[PDB]
Amino acid sequence: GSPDSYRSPLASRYASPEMCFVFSDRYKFRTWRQLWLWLAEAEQTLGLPITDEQIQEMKSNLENIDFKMAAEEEKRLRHDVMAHVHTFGHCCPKAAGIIHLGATSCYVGDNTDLIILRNALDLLLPKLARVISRLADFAKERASLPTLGFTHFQPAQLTTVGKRCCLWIQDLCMDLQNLKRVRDDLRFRGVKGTTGTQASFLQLFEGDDHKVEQLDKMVTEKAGFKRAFIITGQTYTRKVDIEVLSVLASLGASVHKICTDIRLLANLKEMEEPFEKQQIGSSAMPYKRNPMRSERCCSLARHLMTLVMDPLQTASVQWFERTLDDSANRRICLAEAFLTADTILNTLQNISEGLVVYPKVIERRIRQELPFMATENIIMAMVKAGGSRQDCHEKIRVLSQQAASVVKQEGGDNDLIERIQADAYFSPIHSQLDHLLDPSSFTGRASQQVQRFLEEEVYPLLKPYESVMKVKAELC
Amino acid sequence: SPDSYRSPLASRYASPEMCFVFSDRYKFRTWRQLWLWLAEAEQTLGLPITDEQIQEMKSNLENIDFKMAAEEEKRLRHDVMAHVHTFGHCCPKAAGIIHLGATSCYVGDNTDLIILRNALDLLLPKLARVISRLADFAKERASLPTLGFTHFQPAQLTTVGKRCCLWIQDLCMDLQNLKRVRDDLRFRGVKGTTGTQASFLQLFEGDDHKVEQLDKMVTEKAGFKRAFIITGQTYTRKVDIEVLSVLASLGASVHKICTDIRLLANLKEMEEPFEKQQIGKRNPMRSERCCSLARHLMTLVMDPLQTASVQWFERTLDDSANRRICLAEAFLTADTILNTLQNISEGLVVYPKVIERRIRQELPFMATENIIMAMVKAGGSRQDCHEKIRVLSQQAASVVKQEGGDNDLIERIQADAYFSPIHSQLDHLLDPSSFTGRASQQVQRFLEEEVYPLLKPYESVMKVKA
Amino acid sequence: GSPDSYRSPLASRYASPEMCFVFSDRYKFRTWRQLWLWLAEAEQTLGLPITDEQIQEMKSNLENIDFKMAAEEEKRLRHDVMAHVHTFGHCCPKAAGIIHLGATSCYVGDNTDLIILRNALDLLLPKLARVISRLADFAKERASLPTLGFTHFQPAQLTTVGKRCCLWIQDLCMDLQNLKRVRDDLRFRGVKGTTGTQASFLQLFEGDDHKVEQLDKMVTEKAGFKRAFIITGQTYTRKVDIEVLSVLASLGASVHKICTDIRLLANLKEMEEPFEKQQIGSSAMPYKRNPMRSERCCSLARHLMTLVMDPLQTASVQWFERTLDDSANRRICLAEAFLTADTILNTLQNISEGLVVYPKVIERRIRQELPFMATENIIMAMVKAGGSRQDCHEKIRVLSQQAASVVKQEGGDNDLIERIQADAYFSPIHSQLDHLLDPSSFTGRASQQVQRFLEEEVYPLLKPYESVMKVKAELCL
Amino acid sequence: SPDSYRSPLASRYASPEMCFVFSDRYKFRTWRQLWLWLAEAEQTLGLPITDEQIQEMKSNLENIDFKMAAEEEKRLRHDVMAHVHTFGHCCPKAAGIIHLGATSCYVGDNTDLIILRNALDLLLPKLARVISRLADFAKERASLPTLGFTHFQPAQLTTVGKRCCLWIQDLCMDLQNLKRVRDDLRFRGVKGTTGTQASFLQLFEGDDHKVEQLDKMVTEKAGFKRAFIITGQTYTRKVDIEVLSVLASLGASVHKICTDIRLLANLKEMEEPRNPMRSERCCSLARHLMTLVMDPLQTASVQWFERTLDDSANRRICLAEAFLTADTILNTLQNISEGLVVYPKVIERRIRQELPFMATENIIMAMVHEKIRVLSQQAASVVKQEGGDNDLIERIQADAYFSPIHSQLDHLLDPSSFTGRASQQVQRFLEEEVYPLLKPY
Numbered sequence A: 001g002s003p004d005s006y007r008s009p010l011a012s013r014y015a016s017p018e019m020c021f022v023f024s025d026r027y028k029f030r031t032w033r034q035l036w037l038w039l040a041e042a043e044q045t046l047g048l049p050i051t052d053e054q055i056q057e058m059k060s061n062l063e064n065i066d067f068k069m070a071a072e073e074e075k076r077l078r079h080d081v082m083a084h085v086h087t088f089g090h091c092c093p094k095a096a097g098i099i100h101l102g103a104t105s106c107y108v109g110d111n112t113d114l115i116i117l118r119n120a121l122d123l124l125l126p127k128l129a130r131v132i133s134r135l136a137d138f139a140k141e142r143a144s145l146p147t148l149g150f151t152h153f154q155p156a157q158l159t160t161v162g163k164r165c166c167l168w169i170q171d172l173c174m175d176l177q178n179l180k181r182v183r184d185d186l187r188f189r190g191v192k193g194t195t196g197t198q199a200s201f202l203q204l205f206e207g208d209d210h211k212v213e214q215l216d217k218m219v220t221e222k223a224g225f226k227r228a229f230i231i232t233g234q235t236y237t238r239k240v241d242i243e244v245l246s247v248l249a250s251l252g253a254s255v256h257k258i259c260t261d262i263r264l265l266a267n268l269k270e271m272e273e274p275f276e277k278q279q280i281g282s283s284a285m286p287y288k289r290n291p292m293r294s295e296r297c298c299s300l301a302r303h304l305m306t307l308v309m310d311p312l313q314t315a316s317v318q319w320f321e322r323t324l325d326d327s328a329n330r331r332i333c334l335a336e337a338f339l340t341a342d343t344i345l346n347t348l349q350n351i352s353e354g355l356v357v358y359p360k361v362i363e364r365r366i367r368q369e370l371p372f373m374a375t376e377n378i379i380m381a382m383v384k385a386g387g388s389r390q391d392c393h394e395k396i397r398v399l400s401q402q403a404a405s406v407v408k409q410e411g412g413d414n415d416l417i418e419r420i421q422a423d424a425y426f427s428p429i430h431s432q433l434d435h436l437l438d439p440s441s442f443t444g445r446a447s448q449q450v451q452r453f454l455e456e457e458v459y460p461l462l463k464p465y466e467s468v469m470k471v472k473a474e475l476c
Numbered sequence B: 001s002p003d004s005y006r007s008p009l010a011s012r013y014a015s016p017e018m019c020f021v022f023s024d025r026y027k028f029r030t031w032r033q034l035w036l037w038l039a040e041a042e043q044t045l046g047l048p049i050t051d052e053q054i055q056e057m058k059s060n061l062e063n064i065d066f067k068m069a070a071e072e073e074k075r076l077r078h079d080v081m082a083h084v085h086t087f088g089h090c091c092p093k094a095a096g097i098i099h100l101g102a103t104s105c106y107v108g109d110n111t112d113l114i115i116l117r118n119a120l121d122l123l124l125p126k127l128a129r130v131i132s133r134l135a136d137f138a139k140e141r142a143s144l145p146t147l148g149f150t151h152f153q154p155a156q157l158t159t160v161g162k163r164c165c166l167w168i169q170d171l172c173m174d175l176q177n178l179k180r181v182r183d184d185l186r187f188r189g190v191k192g193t194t195g196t197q198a199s200f201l202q203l204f205e206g207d208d209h210k211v212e213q214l215d216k217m218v219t220e221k222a223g224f225k226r227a228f229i230i231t232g233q234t235y236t237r238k239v240d241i242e243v244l245s246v247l248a249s250l251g252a253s254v255h256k257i258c259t260d261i262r263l264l265a266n267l268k269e270m271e272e273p274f275e276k277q278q279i280g281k282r283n284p285m286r287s288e289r290c291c292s293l294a295r296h297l298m299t300l301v302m303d304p305l306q307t308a309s310v311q312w313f314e315r316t317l318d319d320s321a322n323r324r325i326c327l328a329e330a331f332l333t334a335d336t337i338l339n340t341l342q343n344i345s346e347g348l349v350v351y352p353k354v355i356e357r358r359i360r361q362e363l364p365f366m367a368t369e370n371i372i373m374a375m376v377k378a379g380g381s382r383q384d385c386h387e388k389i390r391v392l393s394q395q396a397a398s399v400v401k402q403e404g405g406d407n408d409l410i411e412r413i414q415a416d417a418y419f420s421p422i423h424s425q426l427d428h429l430l431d432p433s434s435f436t437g438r439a440s441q442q443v444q445r446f447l448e449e450e451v452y453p454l455l456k457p458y459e460s461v462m463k464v465k466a
Numbered sequence C: 001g002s003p004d005s006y007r008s009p010l011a012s013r014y015a016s017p018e019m020c021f022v023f024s025d026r027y028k029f030r031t032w033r034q035l036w037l038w039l040a041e042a043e044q045t046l047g048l049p050i051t052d053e054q055i056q057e058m059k060s061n062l063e064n065i066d067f068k069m070a071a072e073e074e075k076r077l078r079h080d081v082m083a084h085v086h087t088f089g090h091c092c093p094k095a096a097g098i099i100h101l102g103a104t105s106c107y108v109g110d111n112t113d114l115i116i117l118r119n120a121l122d123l124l125l126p127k128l129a130r131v132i133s134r135l136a137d138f139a140k141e142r143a144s145l146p147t148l149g150f151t152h153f154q155p156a157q158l159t160t161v162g163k164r165c166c167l168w169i170q171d172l173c174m175d176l177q178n179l180k181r182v183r184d185d186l187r188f189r190g191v192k193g194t195t196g197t198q199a200s201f202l203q204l205f206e207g208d209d210h211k212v213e214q215l216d217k218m219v220t221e222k223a224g225f226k227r228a229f230i231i232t233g234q235t236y237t238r239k240v241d242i243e244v245l246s247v248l249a250s251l252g253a254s255v256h257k258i259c260t261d262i263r264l265l266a267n268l269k270e271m272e273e274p275f276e277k278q279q280i281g282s283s284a285m286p287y288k289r290n291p292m293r294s295e296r297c298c299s300l301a302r303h304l305m306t307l308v309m310d311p312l313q314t315a316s317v318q319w320f321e322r323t324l325d326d327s328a329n330r331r332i333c334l335a336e337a338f339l340t341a342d343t344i345l346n347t348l349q350n351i352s353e354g355l356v357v358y359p360k361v362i363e364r365r366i367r368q369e370l371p372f373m374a375t376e377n378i379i380m381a382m383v384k385a386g387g388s389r390q391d392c393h394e395k396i397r398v399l400s401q402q403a404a405s406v407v408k409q410e411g412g413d414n415d416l417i418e419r420i421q422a423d424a425y426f427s428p429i430h431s432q433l434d435h436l437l438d439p440s441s442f443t444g445r446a447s448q449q450v451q452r453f454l455e456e457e458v459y460p461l462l463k464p465y466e467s468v469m470k471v472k473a474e475l476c477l
Numbered sequence D: 001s002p003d004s005y006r007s008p009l010a011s012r013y014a015s016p017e018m019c020f021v022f023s024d025r026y027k028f029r030t031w032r033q034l035w036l037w038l039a040e041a042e043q044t045l046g047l048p049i050t051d052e053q054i055q056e057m058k059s060n061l062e063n064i065d066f067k068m069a070a071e072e073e074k075r076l077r078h079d080v081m082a083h084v085h086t087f088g089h090c091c092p093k094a095a096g097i098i099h100l101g102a103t104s105c106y107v108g109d110n111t112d113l114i115i116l117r118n119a120l121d122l123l124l125p126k127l128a129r130v131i132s133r134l135a136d137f138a139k140e141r142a143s144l145p146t147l148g149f150t151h152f153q154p155a156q157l158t159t160v161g162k163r164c165c166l167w168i169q170d171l172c173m174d175l176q177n178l179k180r181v182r183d184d185l186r187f188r189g190v191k192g193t194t195g196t197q198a199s200f201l202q203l204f205e206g207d208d209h210k211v212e213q214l215d216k217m218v219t220e221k222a223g224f225k226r227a228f229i230i231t232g233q234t235y236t237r238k239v240d241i242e243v244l245s246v247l248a249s250l251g252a253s254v255h256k257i258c259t260d261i262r263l264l265a266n267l268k269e270m271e272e273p274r275n276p277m278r279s280e281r282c283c284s285l286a287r288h289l290m291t292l293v294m295d296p297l298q299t300a301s302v303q304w305f306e307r308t309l310d311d312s313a314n315r316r317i318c319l320a321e322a323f324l325t326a327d328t329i330l331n332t333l334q335n336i337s338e339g340l341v342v343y344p345k346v347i348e349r350r351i352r353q354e355l356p357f358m359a360t361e362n363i364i365m366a367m368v369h370e371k372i373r374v375l376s377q378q379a380a381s382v383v384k385q386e387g388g389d390n391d392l393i394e395r396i397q398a399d400a401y402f403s404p405i406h407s408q409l410d411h412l413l414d415p416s417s418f419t420g421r422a423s424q425q426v427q428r429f430l431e432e433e434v435y436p437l438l439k440p441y
C-alpha cells in the first residue's frame, strides 16, 4: 500500500491473496462494469434501442478502469456510482448514454456485494473443511490415547486425546453446516428500481410487467444465482448481513475455544504447535516455545465475535426503503469479517497439520492424579474381598491425607499407590492393583464415541470436499 | 414482594406460559422427572433398584420442599446435591439410588434443553400470528399509494402493503431460523462427568450396549429424536449461540419495524391501537417498548459468544450463572416483543387522506419528466419545455421551503398558456396509482409464493388475540 | 417470590439485600411520593396556593402505597406515573389535584433513577475498597515470595506472589477511581417540564424566572445533589447511563482477569480460593477442589461487560427531546448491572479473605523451570572463571537439549543441573551453583515495586474508607 | 494498489494526520527513537556505549528498510527481532547494544502509548471546534421557536438553539472524557520481561537507583509525566478499555445528533450545508466506534498472568480503527456544523398546525372545557380523517360563546410565549459550562 499511511493489517499481514483480491477495488469495479454490460445485453434482447456497437464498446473496456479519473469524478460529484458511470462512458462514448439505463446505484452496489459474499463464503468453506479433515485424522490416530480429563480445569475422569479433539471437531462441523446454509440461501437483489417497485423499467418497457420480470430473471441468471428477492426496498434487506456475520461470529467462538485449549495444553506440555527451524520465541530466550499461532487465532476470533454488533445495529435502524447510514459501516465490517475469518482458518489449518503430542508427559500427569480418582474402585474391590466400606474408607482417607500432604505441603510426587501396596490391610487386593489402575480402563467409551462420531457425522460432511484436501497451509 | 428487586420481565412483560417455563417449579419438577427416568431405565437394564423405590419417586415428583433445598444448598454449596438430598428426604427408600452414575449436568443440561425446546415452541406460533396479521394488512393495502422514502427523503412512490412486505419478509426469515434451531436441538442424555460414560460402563460391568440403550431410553422419554454422540460434561455451548443469534436477529427485525411505525406516527399516516381511557397526545408507546426490548435481545448475543469462547476442555463452571440470566431473559424478552407486536399489528390505523396530502406535496417534482414527454408528444421542442418546467418547479420549491406553503407547481402549469396542449391530461399524468411501479403485483407474488406456504402449518393457532 | 414464575437469580441467588432493596418497587414508588411532596413543599414556599393540610396528607402517606390499586389503575390508563398520581390522590383526597403540579412524568421517573444510581454507586464503592484492602494485605505478606512468571502461559522470568497480586490490585484501583468520578459527576435532573423548557412552571409563577430557578435549586438540594443540569430535554441525557455502565463493564473485565488467574493457579496447585467444611465439589467426587466462586465471578463479570451495549445503543437513537424506547430497556439493564456488580464484589471479597498459597508447590515448579532460564548466568560465571563464551554456550545447549528430551520425550524431571554438576568442564563453578540458582535473586525489583506501589498509590486511595473496612463478606452459595 | 483490499478508513475517510500516526513509518520510526533513548539513558547511567554508536542510531531513525524487516520477520516469526536485526544492519557499530536489557514491549507498548496520546491530541481540537461552531449556531438561534418532540410527537415548544444545546452538552461530556483519559495515560517505561526489571538490575550490578532513573529518563524523553510502577510484561490492557470507552460514548453522541439532523431534514426544518448524506455517514461510522468497545473488554478480561499474546493482532486493528473512525466523524461533523441551514417558514407552518391543540388550556383559563373538546375533535378530524389544515382557531373565532376572547387570540397563540425559559437556559449554559471548556482551545 505504502508505509506512510495506515494499512489494514488484514491486508498487510494476515489474509490470503485470494480473499484480499475478492475485497479489492479492482474486483469491485470490474464487477460493476460486468453488471452494466449484463443490464444492457438483457435490455437489448427485451427490445430497448441499444445497438450491438454500444454493447461491443462496453465488452472491450471491462478491465480498462481509469481509477484516477473515477477518483477525480467522485471528488467533483460526491457520488461513487455516477463517477464510475461517467468514467465508463468516457471509455465508451457510443454506449455512454445507455449505461445504467433504468437502474438505481444499488443495481451495481448491492448486487456486487452479494456476488462478493457468495464468492467469499466459497473460499472459507474448503479451508474449514480442510481443518476438520486434519483434526479428524489426528482424532482417529489418538482415539485410544488416555489423557487426564479437565472440568473446572481440575483433574477429572480420564478422556482420550482423540475424544477431546472431537469436541473441537464437532463445533467446527456445526460451522461448516452454517456456512453452507447461509451460502446457499443468498438471493440476488436483481433489478428493482429506486424504491423496489421497478417503476423506471416498467416505464421503459411501456407498461409490460412480463418484460420487467424477465429482465430481473435474466441478470439474476447471468450472475449465477438461482433466486432473486421478490421483495426489496432500494436494497437487499440488511438482515442478510446479520445472518452472514452471525455464523462467522459463532465460528470465531469455536476457534477461540479450540485455540484456548491448545494454549493450555502447551503449558501442560502435553501438546504443542508446529515450530520452524529458525523461529524465535523470545528476545531473551530463542528456545522458549510460545503457542503464538493459537494466540493470534484467539486474538482475531475475538474481533470476529465483536463485529456481529455492526450489522445488528445497522439493520435495526434502517428507515423505510433504505437509509445510507449502512454504507460506510458495511465497507468495513463485511470485508474485515471475511478477511479475519480467512486468516484464522489458514492459521488453524497450519496448526492442525503440525500438532505434536507428548505421550510420556500425558502419562506422568495421569500417574500423579489417577490414584485419587481410583479410591472408590479400590474400596469396592476390598468390599468384594470381605471388608467393610467404612473401615476401607477411613483407611484410604488416612493414606490419601499422607499422600496429599507430600504433594501440597512438600511439593512431592503422589505416592498413594505405594502406600496402599505397603499396607497389610489391603493385601486382599495387592495383586489386583495393576488391573484397578490401568489408565485405558478409566476412559469409558471414549474411543468408541470417536469412531462412531467420525463415521456417522464427520466423514459424510467431508465427502463433498475431497478435491480441495491436498492444499497445505503456509504462514509468514 | 415489592420490597426486593423483581425482574420486569416477570412483573410487567412476559406471558404466564413463558414465565412458567423458566420457573423454579418447572425446573425442579423436571430434575425429579429426569431422576425417575434414569432409575426406571437403570432398573430395566438390570441395576438392583426396587419397584418400591421407583414408586416413592413417582409419588413425589411435584412434592418439592424449596425451603429445605435452599437450606441444603447453603450447607453444601451445590444446587444439584441439595436437590438430591431433598428428594431423598421425601423418598427415604429411594435415597441413595437417586442420581446413580450421573453427573450434575444430567439434570442441569437436559432440563435446559427441554426448556429451550418448549420455549421455542411458544415463540413459533406467536411469530406466525404476527406474520399472518401483517400479511392481512399487506393484502388489504397492496395497492394504496404512499410516498417512498430513501435517506428519509421523498422518493418513487411505493404502496402501504408493499412496505409492509419489507417487514413481513424479515419476520419470515426469523420464522425459518427459529424452526431450524428448534428442530436441530439434540438431547445431552447420559454422558458421565467428562462425557465418556465411564461411571455407567462400570455399573453395567463393561456392557457398552447397555450404556448406549440407557442413553437412548432417557432421550426417548424426554421426547427427543436424537442425542449428541460427542459431549464433554455439557452439551456444547455453541448451541446457546445458535439460539440467541436467531433471537438477536429477530430483535433487529422488530426494531426496524417498530422504528418505521414510530416514524409513520410522526407523519400521521399510520398509528398504533388506542384504548378509550388511555393517557398520553397519541404516543406510539407499544412500538417504543418493542424497540426498547428488541435492543436488549440484540445486546444479549454477546453473552453466549463470550461464554462458548472461553469454555476450557470438558467444561468450566463460568457458564452457569451467566446462562441462568441470559437464556431466560432472551426468551422472556422475545415473548414480550411478539405478543406486543401482534397487538400492534391487529390494530393498525391508516389515514389515507394524510397519505394523499403528502403525495400531492411531493409528486409534482417527481412527475416533471412525464409532463415534458407529454408536451413533446403534443408538438413541443423539449428544450423549451425543460427550461419552462425548471423555472416553475423553482418557483414552487421556493413556495414550499422559503414560504412554508403547499406545492403549487400544477396550478402554475395550469395557469401557463404554453402548456394548454396538456391541461386536460394533467389528472392522468399525476395519478398516484400509476407511479407505484409493480408494487401491488410484488405483494401478491410474495404472499402466494413465500408467505402463505410458511403459514400453512400454523392454521390452528391463528385465532388467538394478543 | 413465588416459585411458579420466573424470578431473576440476581434477586433469588446473588445480590445483597441492600442492593435488592435500592432497586425494589417499594424504594422506587416511595421516592416518587417523596419527590411529589418536595415539589409541593417548594411550590408552596414560592407562593402557590397549596395548603398545609394538603402537604400534611401527602407527608402522612409516603410509605402507604396500595400496589394493587396502582396496578389496576395502570391497566386502565396504560401510564405508570398517572396510575401512581391517581393512587396517591385516592389516599390524599384534599391534595389530589395539586400532586404533580407543573411537572412531567420524568420529574419522578428520572430523578428517582438518579437518586438510585447515586445510592447504588455508594454501596459498590466500599465493597470495592474492601476487596482492594484485603488484596493489599495479601500483597504485602507475599511481596518477597518468588513464583514462576508466565507470559503466553509459558515459564518466564520469576516474579513474586505479591507483585502479581499488585497487577490485580492496580486494575481495581483504576475502577475505584472511575466509580468515584462517575458518582461525583452525577447531576440532578430537577424540574424541567415536558420538553426541558420549564414552560409550565414559568406560567404557574406568572413569568417569574427567579422563582423557577429557585424551585429547581430547592428540590435539587432536598434530594442531596450539589448540581442540577441546566440543559435537558424531557430526560437527563442517556449518555449518563453509558458513563455508569462503562465503568462497571471495565470493572467486570478486571474481575474476570483476576478470577481467570485464580482458576489457573488452582490448576497449578499454587493458590486456592476458600472452601467450607461440608462443601461438595462434584456429585461424583466430593473431595475434588473446584474454584467455583471465581468461576461465578467470571460468569457474572461477563454479563456486566455484555450490558454496556444496551446504553450505547439506547443513547444513540434517542430522538429529539426524548423517545420512550429507552424506558423498558433501562428497567432491566441499570438494575442488573448494579446487582451483578454487587454480587461480584461481595464474592471477590470473600475469595480474597480466604486465598491459600502453597509455597512448596511454587518452589517445585521453580526448580523444574529455573535451570533453563539460568543458563545465561551460568555461562557468565564460567567466562569470569576463565572459560570461552562459545565453548560454554555449545556445552550448555547440548545439556539443555538432553534435559528437555528427558522432560518431554521421557516425562521426567529436569536434570540439567545434575548434568552440569557431572560435567568436568563446569568444575570451576560447581561450588557456585547454589548461588547461581537462588530463586530470590531472580525476582528483580518485585518486592520493592510492591512496597512503592502500596505506599504511593494504594494506601492513599483507601484512607477515605477506613470505617467500612471491618465488614466480612459472606456467601450463602 | 487496487488489486488488494485497502481499508476505506485510509482510502476514503480519515485525515492524513491521523493516517500518518497509525502508519508503519510512524510506528517503526518510534521503535527506533525508543531504542535511541534507551541507549542514551543507559550510556549516561554508565553502560559501555560509545557516542559513535548513539550517533549512528540517531542518523538512521527514518532510514527503514521495510523489505528487509519483512524478510527477517518471515525467517524469525518475530516482528521486534526482525526490526532489531534490520536496525543493526544499518547501524553496524551500534548493532550489539540495541535493545540492551529490554523486552519486546519496550518498543511495542511504549509506542502504542505514544500513539494513543498523539492521536488523542489530534481529536481534542477537532471536537473543540465542533462544539464552538455548534455553540455559535445555538446562540444565534437561542430564541427561534420550534416544535418540541417527545416520542417524535408534537410537544411543548422549544427553540432551535435550545435543542442544539442538547447536542452540545453531550459533546462537552466527551471533550472532558477525552481530556481526562489523555492526561491520565502513564508510560510503561522500562520494565523487563515480566515487569520486575531483573535484566536492568543485573546490568547495573544491583543498583536500584539506576534502574529507577532509567525508567524516569525514557519516560521524560517520551514526554510523559508519569510511568506505571506496576506492570507485567505489558501496560494493563484496561487502558485500552478506558480509551475505546470514551470513543464509543462519543460515537453514541454523534449518532444521536446526526440522527436528529436527518429527521429535521425530512421535516424540511433544517438541512446540511436533498439528502443528509454527511450525517448518514457519521451515524454509519459512529456505530462502528460503538461496536469496537467489545474488543478491548474481551481482550483485557482473558489476559493471563504477566501477559498473553492474544491481545496483539486484535490491538493492531481496533486501536487504529477506533481513532481513524473518530477522526473521520469529527472532521465530517465539523463540516456539517459550519453552515447548517434553517427554514423558519417551514418551522412556523408546523407550529401553526400543532399549537392550537397545545393552547386549549390557555384559552379555557382566559374564558374563566366541553365546548373546546368538541371543536378540537372537529379540528382533529379535519387533520387526520380529511388531511386538512388545523382550523381550531377559525372554529373558536366563529363561535359566539368565545366572543369575550376573540381579540385576545393573537396574544394567546404567540409561539414566542410558549417557549418557556429555553433562550435563558441556552445563555446560562453557554456562559457557565461551554465557554469555560473552550477557552483552552
Ligand SMILES: O=C(O)C[C@H](Nc1ncnc2c1ncn2[C@@H]1O[C@H](COP(=O)(O)O)[C@@H](O)[C@H]1O)C(=O)O
Pocket (backbone or CB within 6 Å): A078, A079, A080, A081, A104, A105, A106, A109, A194, A234, A324, A327, A328, A329, A331, B150, B151, B155, D012, D275, D277, D280, D281, D284
Ligand atoms: O442511485 C442513487 O443515488 C439513489 C439514492 N440512493 C443511493 N444509493 C447508493 N449510493 C448512494 C445513494 N445516494 C448517495 N449515494 C452515494 O453512496 C456513497 C456513500 O458513501 P459512504 O457513506 O462513504 O459509504 C456517496 O458517494 C453517496 O453520494 C437515493 O436518493 O435514494
Ligand SMILES: O=C(O)C[C@H](Nc1ncnc2c1ncn2[C@@H]1O[C@H](COP(=O)(O)O)[C@@H](O)[C@H]1O)C(=O)O
Pocket (backbone or CB within 6 Å): A013, A280, A281, A282, A283, A284, A288, A290, A292, A295, A296, A299, C151, C152, C156, D077, D078, D079, D080, D103, D104, D105, D108, D193, D233, D309, D312, D313, D314, D316
Ligand atoms: O516469552 C516471552 O514473554 C516473549 C516476549 N513477549 C512478546 N512480546 C512482544 N511480541 C512478541 C512476544 N513474543 C512473540 N512476539 C511477537 O509478536 C508478534 C505477534 O504477531 P501478531 O500476533 O500477528 O500481532 C510475533 O512476531 C510474535 O513473534 C518477548 O520479549 O519476545
Ligand SMILES: Nc1ncnc2c1ncn2[C@@H]1O[C@H](COP(=O)(O)O)[C@@H](O)[C@H]1O
Pocket (backbone or CB within 6 Å): A151, B077, B078, B079, B080, B104, B105, B108, B233, B317, B320, B321, B322, B324, C013, C281, C282, C290, C292, C295, C296, C299, C477
Ligand atoms: N460440574 C458441575 N456441574 C453442575 N453444577 C456444578 C458443578 N460443579 C459445581 N456445581 C454447582 O453448580 C452451581 C453453580 O452455581 P452458579 O455459579 O450460581 O450458577 C453451584 O451450586 C455449584 O456448586
Ligand SMILES: Nc1ncnc2c1ncn2[C@@H]1O[C@H](COP(=O)(O)O)[C@@H](O)[C@H]1O
Pocket (backbone or CB within 6 Å): B012, B280, B283, B285, B288, B289, B292, C078, C079, C080, C081, C105, C106, C109, C324, C327, C328, C329, C331, D150
Ligand atoms: N413521556 C413519558 N415519560 C415517562 N413515562 C411515560 C411517558 N409516556 C408514557 N409513559 C409511561 O411510561 C411507561 C413506559 O413503560 P415501558 O415501556 O414498559 O417502560 C408506560 O406506562 C407509559 O405509558
Ligand SMILES: O=C(O)/C=C/C(=O)O
Pocket (backbone or CB within 6 Å): B280, B281, B283, C081, C104, C105, C106, C194, C234, D150, D151, D155
Ligand atoms: O409526561 C408524560 O406522561 C408524557 C410526556 C410525553 O408524551 O412526552
Ligand SMILES: O=C(O)/C=C/C(=O)O
Pocket (backbone or CB within 6 Å): A151, A152, A156, B102, B103, B104, B105, B193, B233, C281, C282, C283, C284, C288, C290
Ligand atoms: O458436580 C458434578 O457433578 C461435577 C463436578 C465437576 O466436574 O467437578
Ligand SMILES: [Cl-]
Pocket (backbone or CB within 6 Å): A102, A103, A104, A106, A107, A190, A191, A192, A193, A194
Ligand atoms: Cl435497479
Ligand SMILES: [Cl-]
Pocket (backbone or CB within 6 Å): A157, B191, B192, B193, B194, B195, B196, B197, B198, B199, B200
Ligand atoms: Cl463418568
Ligand SMILES: [Cl-]
Pocket (backbone or CB within 6 Å): B101, B102, B103, B105, B106, B189, B190, B191, B192, B193
Ligand atoms: Cl450424566
Ligand SMILES: [Cl-]
Pocket (backbone or CB within 6 Å): C102, C103, C104, C106, C107, C190, C191, C192, C193, C194
Ligand atoms: Cl418536570
Ligand SMILES: [Cl-]
Pocket (backbone or CB within 6 Å): C157, D191, D192, D193, D194, D196, D197, D198, D199, D200
Ligand atoms: Cl528481565
Ligand SMILES: [Cl-]
Pocket (backbone or CB within 6 Å): D101, D102, D103, D105, D106, D189, D190, D191, D192, D193
Ligand atoms: Cl523492558
